[model samples]
Target chain A: GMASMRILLSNDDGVHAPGIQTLAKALREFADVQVVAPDRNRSGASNSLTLESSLRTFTFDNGDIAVQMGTPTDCVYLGVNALMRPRPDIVVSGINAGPNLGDDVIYSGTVAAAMAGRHLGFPALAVSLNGYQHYDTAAAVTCALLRGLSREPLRTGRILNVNVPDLPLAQVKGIRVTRCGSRHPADKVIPQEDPRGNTLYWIGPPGDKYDAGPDTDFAAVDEGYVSVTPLHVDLTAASAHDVVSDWLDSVGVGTQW
Target chain B: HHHHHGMASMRILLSNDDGVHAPGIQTLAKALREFADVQVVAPDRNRSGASNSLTLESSLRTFTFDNGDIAVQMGTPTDCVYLGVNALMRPRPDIVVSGINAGPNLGDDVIYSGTVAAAMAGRHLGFPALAVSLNGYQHYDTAAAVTCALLRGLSREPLRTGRILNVNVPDLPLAQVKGIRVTRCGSRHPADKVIPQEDPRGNTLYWIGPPGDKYDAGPDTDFAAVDEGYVSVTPLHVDLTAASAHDVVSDWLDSVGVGTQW
Candidate 1:
């Protein structure tokens, strides 16, 4: 039954990254996998799209497609609408080189790719490895989740964000369903001067987790379990509408405007 | 119940997806300076669809205009706001206001909008934020006037929430605008198919097509309000967690027999 499933796979790490390379090989064992990704690394690319110019593509000897200067979102948008023939059963992004926990999802190209898939009406999954090594373990975990999804089908109208520990599969503890955690704002900008005496600023590192509660993705991964978070695309703060509406009235917003 | 000193005491960190040179930002900056201390730091060039992307690998340089406005070279809108709030602005801003954008940011456009992303970055860093956009390019004055009014209103009675407000103004003149409506984001159909063309060198190129038509412009949606010449104020959340799906997902994990231990 899994052999008949078709998967559209992409990632933020460039097409040649070991994480995606490893994931594509493992997924092909049980499904028809098509790989489409950026030609260069697009980490921290977020949900950006390439709208100012046209895009070009190159096909590898193995039939995988590489998009020039493409973002993770670009790859999935192109994959779902233009490249993949017969369409795909689902879209799977990553086995990323690093974890995407807490506020990392806000700036994650890997998560954004899955979001694009979900936006275009497909079940999507974004899988990550807590550390650089042991992608095979993450791959195994993802395969298991995909198999389970194929069987029962969680039709929650949301994308699943999965992060696995870097340990071997045998050492893995369990699976946990969790919510996204929170993080402090990024560190201060680092300034440096070039040879010409011109100053440039490099974006600093991400802040440490601030809300790694027991039910958060951070806690789940910290405890050696796989973390699966359901993410939604709608950004409306519906719960705050009443309060904001009342505040508008109290402040006389609609009246004078 | 009014603070007559509110506008004078307020400081705003202003930025936009359209470069610092864009008239929309310039107009808003001028209007805002009339009431609040406005510090303008924006992208050097148009970054309309930049989203929340950050420049991780490369360093960024800044250019200062004679007017004291700063522009980030090749920076995304998020980068501009991040730098503005964290490094550039002194005394720290009381609020963050992005745009008076050349065009509207309604419905699903917010997902890919650098305008909204700038405001989101500000809100993420712990400040009340607003993103203002004009439905069309010719009526930036209308959007600017509307933004000033909202900012004035905010100062008197702060909303006091983590959410950022995304305001889209009708293209009519300020006097012609009907009113303001508090609304939710609407939806849009999937984007049009990519348009393929061959370059002069015989290489094929693909251009992303325009956004799809409105799919859910209900009466209470931002799209509907803007369509009816009303300014739409939508409180947008930066959080992506689907809290409503957690229970269903937890149950599905059990039904699928995907045990806690493999």
Candidate 2:
């Protein structure tokens, strides 16, 4: 009906989740938002592309938003790669229902969408409410956070992995630009005997933070500050390469193979 | 695995599509450990596309080798390497080896072979990696010996970062095994007929049938070397950019005339 910035929106919570709809409504004031998301929740989907399998895309008749019968990463890749002509200025992945902190970025579809945008050279951000059940606190926190982002553009390859505390905005401490943290402890086991007397192992849920040090994402999020951390896609260990090369030389394992 | 190799500091992580109990892993582990610490982590079951997929869907478990310095993951070859480097073990190993595979992994074989995918993952994780295979679809111990010699020679070489070696050994007896040759990856696949089959439950699926593919296999290729009874080493890179298309795609973009946000 009027001129507003065309904002391409997506989330790990799928097309129908309250998270995406509510976040879109809050964003409606400043941007003409468009949505492309998985038809169903793709929680732990990572940077996996669908190259081998045939993918199907469906758009509603009146088109509420684009529903991709695919993973969240695919929604971003195929959405941007094929749809959303003339490249929009920003790509925001969430206001997720939960945090994308610590080592969780590896499995997070939310963070990955932002990563895809970053890899394709865009300033993308992934935001989440730290608790699974906490809603309004995160929605309010995210609106304020987006208000900050909407003010201007960000540098290329820069992403913000923000985890807002469940407390209301008035009680929030502030924002902290932080570093990525180490993994939360994780375990998988069960030595219980069934009624038929057979031993069974039950793989457990993800363990909590074994350590979150000073100025880390976990620490910032722990004390009620939003964790704004920089993330990159390269998994290379630059310092370890030289030592590895020397060892390869000593072993004579093809000096460069 | 990266335990301060005392004097020789190189630990090569070895894996295979053949289960952890396979003899090839046993042979490589035994020989490589003499030079440095060799950590053998492989799948408990043969996972022959098992692709570069890290296990996130299911619960993961690991079984340490009962005898040697090896661990058998109850997961994919990808998981075996991913977890072996990331978790299950500390001190990351230098380089990865997946093979002495029972059959040839060349041409398009690189796609479905977990051996190649495992090596590819290592390269992705910043380690020099290799996937070895023997031609002829037959079992022979000499193919193993050639790879051992190659690995020995490779220990002194440093790979350009983000590269992997895809080696194919000729199917020859130890006495007849020819000299080594460096080669390039060759692609020539004859399209297979797709078979449509209905399951007992009434669902239908298509199966690709037979290897009717012929050889456009060029002279300096792994296929050509193996044909001459020589071992072949094809160095590969993880940069999957379709470089040739960049200029063409850019030209097309100009032709279509899309507006830039800038």
Candidate 3:
């Protein structure tokens, strides 16, 4: 049953990253896994495409994997639009080196890659480990998800953003469904001088700590649980639509210019 | 009160995805100068399709022009707005206006448009932001006029705290143009393909695919309005939560017996 499935494996990290390699190797044992990933670490490159230029690609591991000179969205675009044979049954991104919990999903190339998959009509997933290391723990968790998801797939366009605790497999507390939560977002812009004494600015901190509610992804991960946050691409805030329309009408925005 | 026209004294920050040198951003800054104390800080190069991406891993450099009336950042369009609101502008601004972009950013295009991204960046920093675009590749002055008139009419009214206004104007003489409509974001599914070629060095290269299909252009959609000589105004928000999907997802996961702890 598993041999009938075609899986497109990708990530924001470069192909050389240990997390992707582990995930890829593990998935190949059960399904036909094809890897397409960025050539270098493309961490916060959210849904960005190399529209102005052409993309370069190279094959690795005897054509089992493809390394592309582009962002995560680009890799998924190529995989879904051109590379994969007869289309993939599913698209799986990451087993990323870091967490993509809470508001971090907005800035994550890992999650954005999966969004591209969903956009292309695939049931997609993005998985990550919460700590700086212990990727094997995250890999095992992702492997289990693939095993379960293969039997019962997610709905169309409902991409799952999964974050696992970095503890050993035995220490992982269990799985919990959660919602995205707010983060500090207090990231300050740090100003500095280059060697030429010219003014420059860095993007500053990843924000201070945040408050995670019991049902939030942050809380789930903070405990030893694997957090499964369901995400969708329709960004329309329908509740505010009527209010915004009223304001625009009051301003006479529809009148002659 | 005629005090609505008092916007001539307000400060406005301007940015775009097409970069400072693009004819679109230049026309916008010059035209807005007639209405407000306009300060333009935009990208140094074409940064189209850069969404809400930030340059956290890298540092940035800024250059000034027009005796400091304009500043250009050597980064993405969002970077320009981020720095413009946080570090660059002194005395801040009453509003942030982004684009008179070279082409339309209708429907799903907003997800990838640097023009919209710049406006979203401004909104994130606590300001009323607006994104305007020309449906065709030209006729920027008309779009700029529409922006100025709307800004004047609004008269410092803050749009919903986290929302930004997205305007798409048809390319027509002001006389031939139909009125503007409050519309919704529609859909444009791509019939895309990756074009392949070889570089001089014999390396294989792939060009990003051609344009997508405008499949869902209803009368109430931005695409339909622009196609019929009418300007389209859609309110966009930063929060992407789909409250409807939450319950559906919860039920489905439980049905699948995925060991849900819901």
Candidate 4:
């Protein structure tokens, strides 16, 4: 059944990364896979769309498409609308070099690629490795999810964020469906002096986990389980509508302008 | 007297997707300065669709305007806010307010909007935040006044909902404005196909096409409110967890045989 599925595969780690290459080879075994990925590492690209300049693409000998200076969202958008023929049934991103856990999802190009796919009305999955060593383990987990998705589709109207531990497939624990946890704010900006003596500020590393509870993606991945967190696109806080409405009234934001 | 006292003591960390010198941010800062202490740290150039992207691979530099506004060269809106909150501003700000953006950030636009991302960054860093935009480019005064009203009200009665308020004002003058309506975010159809053109060097270049038409602009959505000349105030959540789909995915996992023990 997977053989009949057309998949659009992409990643933020560049088209030349081993992670994407490994996953593409594995996916090609059972599905029609089209790889459209960024040409360079765009790890923290988030959901940015390039508007000022035109995108240029190059096709490799293996038929993988490389978008020059593109964000993960750009690659997926181009793949679905401009490149792929007859469209793809699903979109899969990553086997990313590192984990996209906690608040990492906010700045993750891997997750953003999948979000673009989901926004275009298709089932999307973002797969990441907890570390760089075991892309095979993550690939196996991704294949399992895709196989399962083919048999019984997940019509949840959300993107699946899957993060696998950096170990052998045999050593991997079970899968856990969890919520997105968060981290404290990023570290302070680091000031440094350049060779020419000008001062520069560097964005420091991400802060430690602030809300990695038992039911969180952080905890699941830490326990060696594959973490699948369902992520939705609608950022509307429907629960706070009443509270905000009352505040508006108190502020006299009435029809009187 | 109490409200005035509250407003006087308030401190605001202001930013925008448009650069610091943009008229929208300048107007907003001017209006905000009358009521509260304002510190502006914005991108040096327009970063409209930057989203939540951060500058991790490179070092950032800043240029200070004569008026005390700081400009972060080549920084995303999120980067400016992050630096402002964690490092730049002295005596930490009480709230974060972004924009008076040049265009609307309705429907799915928020996902790619640096304006909204700036506010989201503020929320993530544990402060009340607001993102204000003008539906059209003409009326910065209307949006600025609306923001002032909101900040003044917030001073009187602090709403601690832990969510960012995304406000979109009509392009009309304040006198012709309708009321404010709290609404939910809407959706859009998929973007148009990319357009291909031949470059001067005989290479094919692709440009991202315009956004698609509104697909889910129901009466209660942000799109409908803005279209009807009312200011749309949509509360936005930073946490993207789809709690409703967790059970559904769990069931699917079980059926797919990749159960809890897989």
TM-score of each: 0.95, 0.57, 0.92, 0.95
Error of 4 at B160 (Å): 1.8
lDDT of 4 at A211: 99
Estimate, for each residue in A25-83, the C-alpha lDDT of model 1 and write its tens digit. Answer: 99999889989999989998999999888999999999999999989888888888889
Give the alpha-carbon lDDT of every model: 0.86, 0.61, 0.77, 0.88
Q: Which candidate number maximizes lDDT?
A: 4
Instruction: Supply DockQ values for each candidate.
Output: 0.73, 0.06, 0.54, 0.74
In candidate 4, list every pair of residues with a backbone clash.
none
lDDT of 4 by residue, B95-191 (tens): 8899989989998788788999999888854346999999988999999989988887776687867469999999999988877899999998888
Give the per-residue lDDT of model 3 (tens digit) for A1-257: 62566788889878888878888888777778888899988887877888888988888754655556688888888888888867777788997988887766766888888877775434578998887577777777777666666556556335889898989877888888788877554437889999999889877665654658898888989899888877865555556667776776777676532
Best-to-worst ranking by DockQ: 4, 1, 3, 2
Answer with 1 or 3, whichever has the higher lDDT.
Answer: 1
Q: What is the per-residue lDDT of model 2 for residues B1-262, given as tens digits with 9 covering 90 to 100?
A: 6322343456667788677877766666665665656777788866653434355545565666557545445566766776666554456767778876777877544544667767765664334577888775564466556566555555435454435667787777766765665666555443333344566766443333343374547887667878888776666643222223334423332333311111
Give TM-scores of the second chain, every candidate: 0.93, 0.81, 0.92, 0.94
- TM-score of the second chain, cand. 2: 0.81
Q: Which stretches of candidate 2 lie over 4 Å from their true place?
A: A1-3, A60-69, A119-122, A184-187, A190-203, A207-211, A255-257, B1-262
Docking class of predicted structure 1: medium
